[PDB]
Every structure is written in C-alpha cells, then in structure tokens.
Amino acid sequence: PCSFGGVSVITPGTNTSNQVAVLYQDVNCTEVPVAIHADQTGSNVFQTRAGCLIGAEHVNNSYECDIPIGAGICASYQTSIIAYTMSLGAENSVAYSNNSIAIPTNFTISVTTEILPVSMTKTSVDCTMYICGDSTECSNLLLQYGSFCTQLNRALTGIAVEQDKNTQEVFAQVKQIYKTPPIKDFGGFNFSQILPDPSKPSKRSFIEDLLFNKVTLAQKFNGLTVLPPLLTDEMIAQYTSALLAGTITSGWTFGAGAALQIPFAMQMAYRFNGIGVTQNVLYENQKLIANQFNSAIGKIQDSLSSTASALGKLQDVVNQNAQALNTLVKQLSSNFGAISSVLNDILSRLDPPEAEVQIDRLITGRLQSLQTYVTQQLIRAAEIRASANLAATKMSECVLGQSKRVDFCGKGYHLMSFPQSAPHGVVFLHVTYVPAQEKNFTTAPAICHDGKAHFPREGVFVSNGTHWFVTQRNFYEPQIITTDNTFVSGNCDVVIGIVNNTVYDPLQPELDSFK
Amino acid sequence: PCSFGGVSVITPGTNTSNQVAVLYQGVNCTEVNVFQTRAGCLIGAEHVNNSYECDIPIGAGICASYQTSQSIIAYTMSLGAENSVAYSNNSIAIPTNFTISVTTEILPVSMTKTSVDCTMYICGDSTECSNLLLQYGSFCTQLNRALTGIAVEQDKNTQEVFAQ
Amino acid sequence: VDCTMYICGDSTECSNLLLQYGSFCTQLNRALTGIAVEQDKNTQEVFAQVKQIYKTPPIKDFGGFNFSQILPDPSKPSKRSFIEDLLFNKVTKFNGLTVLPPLLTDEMIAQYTSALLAGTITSGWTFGAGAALQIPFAMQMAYRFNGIGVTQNVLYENQKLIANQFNSAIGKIQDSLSSTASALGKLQDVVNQNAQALNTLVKQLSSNFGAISSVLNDILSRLDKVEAEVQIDRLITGRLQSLQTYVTQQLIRAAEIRASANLAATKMSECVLGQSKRVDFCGKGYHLMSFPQSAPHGVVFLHVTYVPAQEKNFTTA
Amino acid sequence: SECVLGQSKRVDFCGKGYHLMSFPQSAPHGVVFLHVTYVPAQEKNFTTAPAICHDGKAHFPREGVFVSNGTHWFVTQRNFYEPQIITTDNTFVSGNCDVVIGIVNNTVYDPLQPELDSFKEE
Amino acid sequence: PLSETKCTLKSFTVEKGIYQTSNFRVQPTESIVRFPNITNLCPFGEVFNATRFASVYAWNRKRISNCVADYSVLYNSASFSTFKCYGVSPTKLNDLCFTNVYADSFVIRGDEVRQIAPGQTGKIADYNYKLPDDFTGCVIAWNSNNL
Amino acid sequence: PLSETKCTLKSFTVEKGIYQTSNFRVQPTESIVRFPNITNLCPFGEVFNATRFASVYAWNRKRISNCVADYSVLYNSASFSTFKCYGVSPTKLNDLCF
Ligand SMILES: *[C@@H]1O[C@H](CO)[C@@H](O)[C@H](O)[C@H]1NC(C)=O
Ligand SMILES: *[C@@H]1O[C@H](CO)[C@@H](O)[C@H](O)[C@H]1NC(C)=O
Ligand SMILES: *[C@@H]1O[C@H](CO)[C@@H](O)[C@H](O)[C@H]1NC(C)=O
Ligand SMILES: *[C@@H]1O[C@H](CO)[C@@H](O)[C@H](O)[C@H]1NC(C)=O
Ligand SMILES: *[C@@H]1O[C@H](CO)[C@@H](O)[C@H](O)[C@H]1NC(C)=O
Ligand SMILES: *[C@@H]1O[C@H](CO)[C@@H](O)[C@H](O)[C@H]1NC(C)=O
Ligand SMILES: *[C@@H]1O[C@H](CO)[C@@H](O)[C@H](O)[C@H]1NC(C)=O
Ligand SMILES: *[C@@H]1O[C@H](CO)[C@@H](O)[C@H](O)[C@H]1NC(C)=O
Ligand SMILES: *[C@@H]1O[C@H](CO)[C@@H](O)[C@H](O)[C@H]1NC(C)=O
Ligand SMILES: *[C@@H]1O[C@H](CO)[C@@H](O)[C@H](O)[C@H]1NC(C)=O
Ligand SMILES: *[C@@H]1O[C@H](CO)[C@@H](O)[C@H](O)[C@H]1NC(C)=O
Ligand SMILES: *[C@@H]1O[C@H](CO)[C@@H](O)[C@H](O)[C@H]1NC(C)=O
Ligand SMILES: *[C@@H]1O[C@H](CO)[C@@H](O)[C@H](O)[C@H]1NC(C)=O
Ligand SMILES: *[C@@H]1O[C@H](CO)[C@@H](O)[C@H](O)[C@H]1NC(C)=O
Ligand SMILES: *[C@@H]1O[C@H](CO)[C@@H](O)[C@H](O)[C@H]1NC(C)=O
Ligand SMILES: *[C@@H]1O[C@H](CO)[C@@H](O)[C@H](O)[C@H]1NC(C)=O
C-alpha cells in the first residue's frame, strides 16, 4: 500500500513565536513536499524513527524534554525550533567504596503541591425532550423502542449519588466539627496562609481566594440539567478547617478516638521519631525550622502565584467534561440523512403517514449519539472514583497520622500534611524532610574490642581519620562509643571487615569515683 | 423555551407513612408550604433552622427527614457538633483507660458469572434470523468473549482474596 | 485509528455520507489519542521516579554478592542485562491502523532501570528521598534486618552463608525463566488481548451488514446514486459500530492497564526505593529489598524475603 | 494480606483506631473483615515539659514525655498513663540547657548513687 | 407523586430515599400564527391552463415569488391523473413558506412519466430534463386528449 | 500550520504542544487496467467472409459461444449498409455482453 498517515504541528505556543514545525509519520521522506495536503514545504529535512519532520534542525547537544514527538525526540525554542534526543538529567556515577557512609549535616524542609480530582459535576440528562422536545407523536415512537432511556437515568442517577458518595467518603472522615483556637502562638510557626480568616466570607482561607479565581471554565437551556453538589461549597472549607484543627492543635490522635492535648512545638518530636531522628534536633534548631517552614509556606503561594504549570489536571477535568457536554449539544444540529435537524421542519412540509420514516433514522442517530455520552461519562466516572478512593486514602494515612510508605505523600520523608479546599479536588501540603550537605567519612560496619564484637543500637561508626564516633542512620550528630549504645555477641574473627578501637565504659569512672 | 425541569420525589419508606414531598429541579417557585433551594423548588417540606444530621440528601447542603404531628422537614445539614480542643504550649492529655472496639468492614469480591448466547437472545431458534445474524459476521462472538473474560476474572478475584 | 480510512476506502461518496453523520469519528479519534497520552504517562510515572542517572562503579567488590545477572553488560550493543535478554526473547495494515511508537525506547527504559539499580546497590534507600548517600552493600542489609527485627550480628556472623544463598537464588531465577515459558503469560495475555481485537477489527469488512456486497468498490461500480446510498447507509452503521465497539474494548482494558500501572509504581516506590513494612505485598515473606528489570510493555521485580525454617519447640512464659 | 496476616501501621486502613489484628468472615459474593482496634479513652489533662535541665545537661526521654500533675514530675508512655520515676535509663542527654526552649528544672534520680552512697555509709 | 413513584419502580413499596419519576414542562397556552402577506395571488392557473405549452426539448421555466400561494384550491380540485411530491407531502404545502417557486412546464408521453422521477434514469431524464436526487417539490401530470 | 491548528481547536491562542489534526495520501497516477493474454478470437471469418452463402428459408442457426468477437474491427472497416444496433451503443457492447 502506498504510504499515508497522520500529520501534525509542533508549535512553541502562539504568542511566543510563529516558527512552526511539521511532522510526517513513518513515511520515507522522499515524496513528502509534493503530493497533497501541504499548507504551503521548506528547506531542512531530518529523519527520525517516528518518521521525518520539516521545520527544525537536529542538534547533537541534548536537553531536558519539553514536547514529546516520539522515539526519544523532543522539541523546543532557542531564538529557533530544533529537535533533539532527550536527556535524562546529570549523568554522574557518584562515589562508592566499601568503607564510606555519606551522612547529611544541614537540612531543608520543603513543600510540594500535589492535587487530585475528587469529584465531577453531577450532570443529568432528560430522556424524552432531548430526543424530541415536548412533541407528542415523536414521543409515541419513542415508547415503542421499549425502555432505553429508563435505564440511562438510573445509570446517570447511579453515578449522581456516586460522587456524592465520593465527597462524603473523602472529607468527612472525622465525625465532628472542630474549633480552631483563638490565640495564635504556636512556636513561631506562622500558619497564616492556611488558617481560615474571619475578614473573608466567614469561613474562607488565604489560599482559596488565590485558588477560586484561578480555576474557571455551558448554562441552563434546552436538554440539560446541572444539579448542584450535595455538600454545599461553603462548608467544604468547614470540614477542612476542622481537619486543620486537631492536627494543628490536638495532634494525630483524633483519627483514632477522643482528642488529646499536646502543644505543636513538641508534636514534631514525635514526628522526628517518625523517621528515626532523636528529639534533641528539634529544640536545638527550633527557630531554624521556623523560617524554612515559613519560606516553604511562603513559596507555596508564589509558585502558584502567576501561572504554575501544575494546575493542569484539575483545570481540564471541567473542560473535557464541558466539551463532552457541548458535543452532545452539536448533535441536535446533526442531520443523519433526514432533511432537517429541528423536528418542526419535518412536521411542516411532510406527510404524517410517511414522515415517521425520516423520524425513524432521526430517533436512532440521536440515540446512537446518546450512547456515546453514556460510555464517555461512565469510563471516566470509574476512573475518577478509583482515583478518588486513592485520594481519600491519601487523606487517610497522610493527614490523620504519620505514614511510612515512602514516596506516597510528598517526595521525601513524610513529616505531616495540610489539606486545603479546592473546586473539585483536594490540595495537600506535603511537608517532607529533605537532607543535604553531606560529608563522606571513614566508616566501618563493626567494632572489635576484647575479641568480642560490638554493634550500635541504631546508626553507624564514622571516623575523621583518628577518632571513631556514633551517629544515627539519617542525621549527623557524633557521640562517644559507650557501653549502653551497643551490645555484644560472638568472637571477633568470624566477621570480615572489622577495624579496631577501644570502647569506653561509663561504669569504670563510676568504679573510679569511689576508691 | 418555557420552563421545564426534572421532577423527583422525596419520601421516607412506606412502612412509616405515605406523606411525600416534591422537588421541581432547576425551576423556582414562581412557575409551578413552599421552600426555595438552589436545587430547585421544594414543596411538601417545612424549613427548620435547627441542624440535624442528614437522613435524605437533596442538594446544595439541604437534607430531609420525617420526624415529629409528623411531616417532612428540610434543613441545612450539620457536620457533627461544634467543638474545639483546648490548647497551650504546656498542656497535654494522656489516656488513663482504653476500650477495645470491633469495627465491621464489608467489601464485595465477586458477582454472578452470567453468560449469554447472542443467537439465542436475538433469534429464538429460527434459521432465517440466524442466517441474517451471520451476515453481521462476528460481532456476537465478541460479546460472548467479553462475558467469558468476566466469568474467569470473577473466579480469579475470589482466588486472590481467599487463597492467601 | 483513522476514522475515514476504516469507514471508507477511497470513495468521496462514502466520505460525504460520513460528514453528515456529525462529529462522530473525531470523538473516537480523541479518546484513542487520550489512551495514547495515558500509555506514555504510565511509562513516565513508573520508571522516572528518580531525579538523575547513576551508573555503577567499576569495582565488583561487594563482600561476595554478585549482580552481573541484573547489571547490564557493556559488551552488548543494547546495554541490557542477561535476565532482560531472557525477557526479551520469551515474548513474540492500510486501513487506518497505525502503530505510533512508544515515547521511550527500551534502551532508554534500560537507562532508568540501571539508574535505579545502581543507587539501590550503592546508596541505601536514601537516594529516593533526597541527595544520594553512599554505603557499603554489606551494611545495607544491616539496615534492612533492623527493618524486620533482626539483630545485625546475624547478617555479619553469616555473611558468607547469605551471599552464596543469594547467588544460588539468582541462578534459580535465571533457570526458571530460561526454561519455562508459562510464567511470562501475564505479559503474553496483554499483547494477545491486544492482538485479538485488531484481527476482529479488520475482519468485519468481510461482513455485508445486509448489503449486496461487503466490499465498497463493487457497489460504487454497479449502481447509481440513489439506490446505492441506501446500501452505503447499511455499510456505515456496523462498520462505525464495530469501531465504537473497538473503542469501548480498548478503553475498559486501558483502565485495567491504568489500574495495573499505579500498583506497579507504588511497588517501585514501596519495595525498590525503600523497605515497606507491609507484609504480603512484594513477594512472600518479611520484605527486605528488590531489584527492577526492563521488560517489553512491562516491568519485572525481583523481591528478596526472609523466610525462616528448621524450628524446634519451646516452652514459653 | 496486611491486616490478617499482620498488623497494619497504616492508620485507619483496617478499622478506626490503632490496629491490632483482624478476622475474616465469608459472605456471599464478598468478604467481611472484623477489625479489632485499640481506642484510648478516659484521659486527664496534665501540664508537660519538652525537656529537663538537671545540672546544665538537658535531659530528653528515650520514650514517653515528661508530665506534671502538681508538685511532682514524672515520665510516662504515650497512649497510657503509667507514671514512672525519672531515671537516667528512661532518658538521655544532649547538649546544655541554654539552647532548649520551654524547658523546666527538676532533679533526676540516678540508680547508681544510692548503692554507692550505701557503700560510703559503710 | 407517590403513585408516580410506585408506577416508576414497578412495586407497591417505596423505601426511604429520593427517586426521580418524571419531567415537568410548561405547556403552551395558545397558538400564534404569523406569515408574510402579499396582496398578489400566485398565477398557477395561467400555466396549467395555457393554451399552447412548451416541448420537452425547450421546456418552460416560469418563476414565482412576491405572491400569496393558494395550493389548496389547486389540490382540492380534480383534474390531475397523479399528484406526487418528494421530500414534502402534498397536503402540507399550504403550511410552509418559501423564498422562491419555479414552475417547470412541458408535455410528455405516458409511458415516460414512469421515468420523470428524481434520480430515476432513462432517456428523457438524462438527455432532456433532469431532477436532482435531493429534489424537493411536487410533480403534477394530467392526461391530454383534447388539449 | 499555525492556523491549521485553529481549523479544529476552535480558538486562536493554541497552547504549546502537539496536535494530531491532519492526514494525507498519495493520489493515483496512471490507472492501468490488465487482462489475460487475449488470444481467444471468435471465428467470424467463416460467417462474414465466408464463401458458401445461404438464403432466408434455410438459415443455419450456427452457434457462437465462449470466445471474444472483436467488434472493433467490424466498425472501422466502414463498408456496411444497414449497421444498426437496437438498444445498445457500439461503444460498450464489448463491455456488457449477452
Ligand atoms: C503568552 O501568554 C501567556 C499568558 O497569556 C504568558 O504567560 C506568556 O508569558 C506569554 N508569552 C510571551 C512570549 O509573552
Ligand atoms: C528510504 O529510502 C532510502 C533509499 O531509497 C533508504 O536508504 C532509507 O533507508 C529509507 N528509509 C528507511 C527509514 O528505511
Ligand atoms: C552534529 O551532527 C551532524 C550530523 O551528523 C554532524 O555532521 C556534525 O559533525 C555534528 N557536530 C557538530 C559540531 O555540528
Ligand atoms: C504571618 O505572616 C503574615 C504575612 O502577611 C504576617 O502578616 C503575620 O504577622 C505573620 N504572623 C506571625 C505570627 O508571624
Ligand atoms: C569522599 O571522600 C574522598 C576523600 O579523599 C574524596 O576524594 C571524595 O571526593 C569524597 N566524595 C564525595 C564528597 O562525594
Ligand atoms: C575529629 O573530631 C574530633 C572531635 O573533637 C577532634 O578532636 C579531632 O581534632 C578531629 N580531627 C581528627 C583528624 O581527628
Ligand atoms: C575494601 O576493598 C579493598 C580493596 O578494594 C580491600 O583491601 C579491603 O579489605 C576492603 N574492605 C572491606 C571492609 O571490604
Ligand atoms: C412493617 O410493615 C408491617 C405491616 O405494615 C408492620 O407489621 C411492621 O410493624 C412494619 N414495621 C414497623 C417498623 O412498623
Ligand atoms: C425565579 O428566578 C430567581 C432565581 O432564583 C428567583 O430569585 C426569583 O424569585 C424567581 N423569579 C422571580 C421573577 O421572582
Ligand atoms: C429561624 O431563623 C430565623 C432567623 O431569621 C428565626 O426567625 C427563627 O426563630 C429560627 N428558628 C428557630 C427554631 O429559632
Ligand atoms: C515439638 O515440636 C514438633 C514440631 O512441630 C511438634 O509437632 C510437637 O508437638 C512438639 N512437642 C510438644 C510436646 O508440643
Ligand atoms: C482538662 O481536660 C479536659 C479534656 O476534655 C478539658 O475539658 C479541659 O479544658 C482540660 N484542662 C484545661 C485547663 O483546659
Ligand atoms: C508558652 O508561651 C507563653 C507565652 O504567652 C509563656 O508564658 C509560657 O511560659 C510558654 N510555655 C513554655 C513551656 O514555653
Ligand atoms: C384553470 O385553472 C383554474 C385554476 O388554476 C381554474 O379556475 C379553471 O377552472 C381552469 N380551467 C379549466 C378549463 O378547468
Ligand atoms: C502472449 O504471451 C506470449 C508468451 O511469451 C508473449 O510473447 C506475447 O507478447 C503475449 N501477447 C500479448 C498480446 O502480450
Ligand atoms: C474480410 O477479408 C478482408 C481481406 O481478406 C479483410 O480486410 C476484412 O477485414 C475481412 N472482414 C471480415 C468481417 O472478416
């Protein structure tokens, strides 16, 4: 078969430039600029595995991919349009030995936007007046087709209660409303971006006015209804405002049972124990936590300030639904071989002993179009709920308590979280624990003294060449090899790779305290 | 086009009462006890400025119920009771006792393995209908195929759950 | 799938009647392209869970452990591993059908795996968290035996015992997949469940749907405009319907693949990038660690558990 | 898998409360899990501290938190009140007590001093 | 309403819940008919009763506009062997309202009115005068034995 | 290609990204038509260029079946007096046949 396929357009965006690029798909690039369907084409020709393309040049240098073409080839703008083999970041085999642990010293505490859709707009479609529109003899020919649209309502009412069941099962997983405390002195931790504020409409938060205006787009006319969601929009904040409260004030305990008093300045001490970091790192660096936590909450409005590229999934999920609504509307003006689209033109100038034959295919293709809208809703409806049940699960392990499954709530060691309201979703504030500024040390897996092995309770042994030390698996804080921090078992020589050092006994100067 | 809207009935079960209410969706009460909601025009229910937890959902934060003579009433749903946790930087709460609860958590694992013969369902036994169904080719092998996939798949689900 | 070419061969008279059926086939063009975005996005979410690339150090000193079976050799042109080569040999038009290639080549898929392989050998779990942090592999098991409540003398006092058993465990993995072909059936079904739908998509053109001929060019050649328009009318409904039947089969199966993928990347998260507590989730036994390998349209994990044996009975108190 | 064949650390996955176990039960076209949970109740309100300065040395708990009911200080675990006399084997040390904030003062009993003092008495 | 629910659910028992049952639609109150009005009547009698007609080789196209039609009197009278309309029903023409009307006048033999239909092939249809397959309009034929 | 995207995205400011929107084919060029190596040759020289000619009372109803009679050489000879075909063109009676 002589070659044919789809042909597309690469653009860097409308207002950025007008240099374009044309991709031909799996055609050997010989008969290309000649035959047909060319909006003319140019000078350069380059061949890829995905076909050949016109409107760029191949560059031996590589960069981060932006625009997917195919086969590991991406395109961008330079002042011009080029194409290039993808990169994968910095190719660096970092160091390796058999006696070296890299331990971090300082650490940042960042945040990460992660947003999931939790719902969709409860559309609902009338049967009869979509098919005919308040007209008698058209509707009498509907009921001889049995019970098509009777189950279509129960399909769509079935999904109508479903997102109401989803919204119920994704926020109100506490039993009761909580009240934020009136005084605000939580160890310097400024929660002013995420708390509800009274000077707004009575329940709203500061992220919300930056968020409600950001998510925008038909209306009430023929053929459609838009039933409002079950839980009203104002109290959507009020559940979350309650959801802030205990995990601000009372801590993680209210997911289980009755709440408990605890101050937030020491809640992170339990949470620093959540990844195995001792409780001294809080109080010795409390103010250092504060500004970095302030700046992370500072930057989180700022990344979302002008136009982030991470609204995305929550913006189009209205939009692809909306054109799916809208493409149902264009089918009213379809014609299907009948000589009209409106019913009244058929009832104007035709013969009612035969005009139903023109109606006969007119009923089908409109109903045939309706079945397309049935499935297109239903498949994503399962796709939303299966995503939404994950979203409530992300509400579960990551808001009510401090989970352990890594890279499930924020990239990094999970400390805590903060849910915020959204138009049809949930926005979490995953607060991770990212360490940095490593200093590689001379390390050993075991210590022999007195022919007998020693193993730390948690952590490693490092030395700066001369003196050995003890610190934990994820943070640097050296201490003295003691008796209490280790235990004993076995002879020395059965284990390879052991170095030699004396072990301090605290009981011996206690033995030497009295003589 | 002059106004229209879907119509739905709010009611409790019939083993308590026959009293009802009506919801004229997306159409307000100047065109049909009356109450205006952002769902539509609600008739047969009485508004109450107390907040009782939801028993029947309607829309827009309104729920209905049948409580005591006796009538349908509408109200703005509560979200549980208003409460607040006492707080300071030098106060904590620790339990002194406990309790062992037992929660029930039900899930479905399978459904009935149904299989349908297309030729049967369409054509009773008639050879004429069967010949004219053949000329559609092999649609209705696809349907049997899909149902068979479901039937196997429902056994696999049960196997994965219980044969741990 | 081109909608026009599968519905109509080359006659514009067929194409005229399709045009007054509204904007049908653009929707089917949309959702299949919607599948086409999801397939790349699923590949994006599974293997690009790492910030950057790490290739292995040239020293093969690891206290007796071997990883030559899962490391790629530089000797091959396609820098893949031998287990992958075992996995890359046990898996085997003109009507709108168009195989758009995947976004990443399997060499690039091998790049992510080898990247995820090396830091898992060389940097503990820590590279999945933040900056990479080096470690001897002799000590990384000493992290992990603390993860299931084993004192780390048991690792160190029996290091030679564990390594050869770890080696001979890999030889069974090399054995079980280079002889038997049954265990690769899960991937084998997905290509076959794909392939059966393709063949039944094409063969519907042999059906008349109550026309005088199933081929389109004969009806254009022997009848006039009026009477063949009824015959073409029967040809569209049924070809278009099979196309919509094809889309519906593709979409539901895609959601299963979509449901498959998030389970995979979570296991790339919970069982490769770190040490999950969740029992019965990655292999059978107390979970220690894992290794991912490249696979056509898929991924193969190799989980390592701690299964005890050889018990006595013990009076307790 | 995660709640019958083991204990879920995932909060509020298998039952509401801290999870202990589960039991399965057959059902037609389904299954029934009976989660058993530990639910704290009947608490009191104590005044706490983050840490203690004894001689200059800051003390922190290995487990639990420092509490005060009144004219006395204790340490105790976290989901159950079981007040313990503070000792150096309940706690640990790091740094001086000028760097901590919200700290309080208290003497820590040491279990070595009485035996040693007993020998000086002899 | 309760009976509507019972009828919808196909049971005499209705449980606690909300059930959609029907649709409400405001009905019309009266009819209002509107049309353009011309003080001229369309000269159709002038063509059917013309004393000398056009041959099919050189067939006459007279054009009609700016007039009020009256087809009912032309229908309701019986002088016509057959009165067939395609895409339109002959009783309904008095309801519609058009922009142009063309009266295509000629004479033909009898066995060849089998052939005059739109899209139907044959000698007169393809060589002399053609009607498109998407034709809308009316064909009248009446026998001529003294005309 | 800029506003070719506008031909189906229904807007002006199209966003940076790929848009599968258009196709092509290759037009047919020569339209060759093939047949078997003809070589069949209905005997007409024994019924037209014959020697023994008959009358109207003793017309031998002789059979011609299952060959090809090239009527095209019975056209450009142009020596006929009453060459009249009733109901079929001489152009495509080689195309449709009884
Ligand atoms: C194009 O418009 C967008 C938003 O309208 C803006 O963010 C972007 O900077 C513009 N591009 C240029 C090159 O100005
Ligand atoms: C296209 O054709 C040329 C020569 O005709 C050949 O060298 C080249 O390999 C072909 N392209 C592909 C992709 O095979
Ligand atoms: C870049 O690639 C082209 C194409 O193979 C080659 O001719 C050229 O030498 C390469 N290097 C530079 C610096 O352009
Ligand atoms: C929190 O930050 C906001 C920024 O506008 C500031 O106005 C407010 O005073 C801060 N609150 C505290 C307690 O620092
Ligand atoms: C590890 O320490 C060695 C000591 O010489 C140094 O050369 C190397 O750069 C270090 N690697 C790091 C810091 O990644
Ligand atoms: C290592 O750290 C100890 C800790 O105080 C210090 O005394 C010593 O000078 C450092 N350097 C070397 C080379 O031991
Ligand atoms: C580390 O490797 C060196 C040689 O590469 C060897 O001499 C030394 O014994 C090894 N140490 C351990 C602990 O494996
Ligand atoms: C349910 O129905 C029967 C008949 O009305 C009655 O005997 C029974 O008491 C009813 N249930 C309740 C809760 O009243
Ligand atoms: C119906 O329309 C609006 C919509 O809520 C409502 O406020 C109003 O009372 C009704 N119409 C009139 C004219 O009162
Ligand atoms: C309803 O709220 C209104 C405030 O406008 C008040 O008139 C009425 O008394 C409230 N209902 C009750 C039970 O207090
Ligand atoms: C000793 O161990 C075996 C191994 O399972 C067991 O069968 C036996 O009952 C044990 N002995 C006693 C007295 O329980
Ligand atoms: C005492 O604990 C209870 C817990 O409900 C609480 O009522 C009370 O406010 C606590 N003490 C103080 C000073 O708040
Ligand atoms: C808590 O902060 C307040 C400031 O109003 C202070 O009076 C109190 O002593 C602080 N408590 C602790 C334990 O730091
Ligand atoms: C002429 O036609 C008109 C109406 O078209 C009618 O009044 C008249 O009777 C006709 N003439 C004859 C001879 O029938
Ligand atoms: C028929 O076949 C012969 C066999 O070689 C060939 O030479 C001859 O040209 C063919 N006739 C025609 C008309 O092509
Ligand atoms: C008859 O024969 C002459 C020459 O012999 C030839 O030109 C002519 O075409 C033939 N006609 C027929 C019908 O055989």
Q: Is C2 on the interface with F (CB under 8 A)?
A: yes
Compute the distance between CA of residue D48 and CA of residue D61 in angstroms, rounded to an integer.
13
Of A348, A352, A355, the CB nearest to E96: A348
When scoring B118, B128, B133, B138 by the number of chain C Cβ atoms within 10 A, the one with the most, hence best to mutate, is B138
Of residues D62, D58, D118, the one with CA closest to residue D93:
D58
What resolution, expressed in A, was reported for this entry? 4.5
Compute the distance between CA of residue A217 and CA of residue A494 in angstroms, rounded to an integer.
71
Q: Is E133 on the interface with C (CB under 8 A)?
A: yes
Q: Which residues pair with B22 in a beta bridge?
A: B9, B43
CB proximity under 8 Å: C 9-28 to F = 26
Of B132, B138, B164, the CB nearest to C203: B138
Compute the distance between CA of residue E123 and CA of residue E137 in angstroms, rounded to an integer.
22
Distance E90 CA to ligand 2 centre (A): 66
Residue/partner pairs of B103-106 with CB below 8 Å, 24 or more apart: B103/D15, B103/D16, B103/D17, B103/D34, B103/D35, B103/D37, B104/D32, B104/D33, B104/D34, B105/D14, B105/D15, B105/D32, B105/D33, B105/D34, B105/D35, B106/D27, B106/D30, B106/D31, B106/D32, B106/D33
Straight-line distance from the first to the last Cα atom of chain C, in angstroms, rounded to the nearest whole number: 71
Neighbours of chain C (3+ CB pairs under 8 A): A, B, D, E, F
Identity of residue A445? P
User: Residue C100 gets which letter from DSSP?
Assistant: P
All residues of chain E having their beta carbon less than 8 Å from the beta carbon of residue C224 are 119, 121
Nearest-CA residue for atom 13 of ligand 5: A440
CA distances from C85 to C90, C167, C174, C189, C293 (A): 9, 19, 11, 20, 10
Q: How far off is chain C from D64, nearest CA to CA, in Å?
A: 21
Number of residues assigned to chain F: 98
Tokens 């393309």 identify what position?
A53
Tokens at C51, concatenated: 């910030």
Q: Torsions phi, psi of D93, nearest 5?
A: -120, 145
Compute the distance between CA of residue A227 and CA of residue A218 in angstroms, rounded to an integer.
13
Tokens 């001294």 identify what position?
A280
Whether D contacts E, i.e. 3 or more CB pairs less than 8 A apart, is: no
Residue/partner pairs of A164-169 with CB below 8 Å, 24 or more apart: A164/A122, A164/A229, A164/A230, A164/A231, A164/B57, A166/A118, A166/A119, A166/A384, A166/A385, A166/A388, A166/A389, A166/A392, A167/A118, A167/A119, A167/A229, A167/A230, A167/A231, A168/A230, A168/A231, A169/A389, A169/A392
Using an 8 Å Cβ cutoff, are B105 and D35 in contact? yes
Compute the distance between CA of residue C268 and CA of residue C46 in angstroms, rounded to an integer.
7
Using an 8 Å Cβ cutoff, are F74 and F89 in contact? no
Pairing of strands B71-76, B46-48: parallel
Distance A210 CA to ligand 4 centre (A): 17
CA-based radius of gyration for chain F = 30
**Which amino acids bring their CB within 6 angstroms of ligand 10?**
B 49-50
Residue A314 has a CB neighbour count (10 Å cut-off) of 21
CB contact under 8 A, B138 and C249: no
User: Residue A2 gets which letter from DSSP?
Assistant: -
Compute the distance between CA of residue E122 and CA of residue E108 in angstroms, rounded to an integer.
14
Residue A2 has a CB neighbour count (10 Å cut-off) of 12
CB contact under 8 A, B95 and D1: no
Straight-line distance from the first to the last Cα atom of chain F, in angstroms, rounded to the nearest whole number: 56
Q: Residue B160: which residues within 8 A CB-CB, separation 6 or more?
A: none
Q: How far off is chain C from B119, nearest CA to CA, in Å?
A: 16
Q: Which ligand is the nearest neighbour of the Cα of A48?
A: 2
Compute the distance between CA of residue C275 and CA of residue A272 in angstroms, rounded to an integer.
18
Residue C18 has a CB neighbour count (10 Å cut-off) of 18
Using an 8 Å Cβ cutoff, are C246 and C198 in contact? no
Distance A295 CA to ligand 4 centre (A): 12
Of C27, C101, C244, the CB nearest to A49: C101
Task: Decide: helix, strand or coil at residue A354.
Answer: coil
User: Residue C73 gets which letter from DSSP?
Assistant: P
Nearest-CA residue for atom 2 of ligand 10: B49
**Which amino acids bring their CB within 6 angstroms of ligand 5?**
A 95, 440
Judge if the beta carbon of residue E43 lies within 6 A of ligand 14.
no
H/E stretch holding C298 reads strand C298-306
Residue/partner pairs of C66-69 with CB below 8 Å, 24 or more apart: C66/C166, C66/C167, C66/C170, C67/C117, C67/C121, C69/C170, C69/C173, C69/C174
Sort D89 into a burial class: Cβ within 10 Å, 0-12 / 13-18 / 19+: exposed
User: C174-203 burial by CB neighbour count: b if 16+ within 10 A, else e?
Assistant: eeebeeeeeebeebeebeeeeeebeebbee
Question: Read out DSSP for A428-491?
Answer: EEEE--EEEEEEEEEEES-EEETTEEEEESSSEEEESSS-EEEE-TTS---B---STTEE--SB
Compute the distance between CA of residue B101 and CA of residue C116 in angstroms, rounded to an integer.
44
Handedness of CA B126, B127, B128, B134 (dihedral sign): positive
Question: Read out DSSP for chain B?
Answer: ---EEEEEEEE--TTT----EEEEET--TT---EEE-SSEEEES-EEESS----SEEEETTEEEEEE---EEEEEEPP-S--------SSEEEEEEEEEEEEEEEEEE---------HHHHH-SS-HHHHHHHHTT-SHHHHHHHHHHHHHHHHHHHHHHHH--
Nearest-CA residue for atom 9 of ligand 13: D102
Task: Decide: helix, strand or coil at residue D74.
Answer: strand
Atom of ligand 9 nearest to the CA of B28: 1
CB contact under 8 A, B4 and E13: no
Q: Which residues pair with D34 in a beta bridge?
A: B104, D23
Q: How far off is chain B from A216, nearest CA to CA, in Å?
A: 20
All residues of chain A having their beta carbon less than 8 Å from the beta carbon of residue E23 are 126, 128-129
Q: Determined by which method?
A: cryo-EM
CB proximity under 8 Å: D 68-87 to B = 76, 78-81
Sort A11 into a burial class: Cβ within 10 Å, 0-12 / 13-18 / 19+: buried
Question: Read out DSSP for A303-335?
Answer: HTTS--S--THHHHHHHHHHHHHHHHHHGGG--
Q: Is C157 on the interface with F (CB under 8 A)?
A: no
**Which amino acids bring their CB within 6 angstroms of ligand 7?**
A 98-99, 497; C 61
Straight-line distance from the first to the last Cα atom of chain D, in angstroms, rounded to the nearest whole number: 62
CA distances from A95 to A88, A440, A441, B18 (A): 19, 10, 12, 79
Using an 8 Å Cβ cutoff, are C293 and C83 in contact? yes
Compute the distance between CA of residue C123 and CA of residue C137 in angstroms, rounded to an integer.
8
Task: Decide: helix, strand or coil at residue D92.
Answer: strand
All residues of chain D having their beta carbon less than 8 Å from the beta carbon of residue A262 are 48
CB contact under 8 A, D116 and A256: no
All residues of chain E having their beta carbon less than 8 Å from the beta carbon of residue B27 are 24
| Residue to mutate (ligand 10; options B47, B49, B52, B73; most atoms within 8 A of CB) | B49
Sort D24 into a burial class: Cβ within 10 Å, 0-12 / 13-18 / 19+: middle
Judge if the beta carbon of residue A307 lies within 6 A of ligand 1.
yes
Compute the distance between CA of residue C20 and CA of residue A339 in angstroms, rounded to an integer.
11
Q: Residue E25: which residues within 8 A CB-CB, separation 6 or more?
A: A129, A134, B2, B3, B4
Q: Residue E85: which residues within 8 A CB-CB, separation 6 or more?
A: E93, E137, E138, E139
CB contact under 8 A, A286 and D13: no
Angle value at C-alpha C74, between C69 and C75, nearest 5 degrees:
90
Task: Decide: helix, strand or coil at residue A224.
Answer: strand
Sort D92 into a burial class: Cβ within 10 Å, 0-12 / 13-18 / 19+: middle
Sort C316 into a burial class: Cβ within 10 Å, 0-12 / 13-18 / 19+: exposed
Report, in this order, helix, strand and coil percent for chain C, each rounded to 5.
55, 5, 40
Atom of ligand 16 nearest to the CA of F73: 9
Torsion on CA atoms A475, A480, A483, A486, rounded to nearest 10: 30
Of residues E48, B156, D121, D12, the one with CA closest to residue A257:
D12
CA distances from D112 to B22, D60, D74, D93, D106 (A): 81, 19, 19, 17, 18
Distance A307 CA to ligand 1 centre (A): 10
Q: Residue C6: which residues within 8 A CB-CB, separation 6 or more?
A: C95, C96, C97, C239, C243
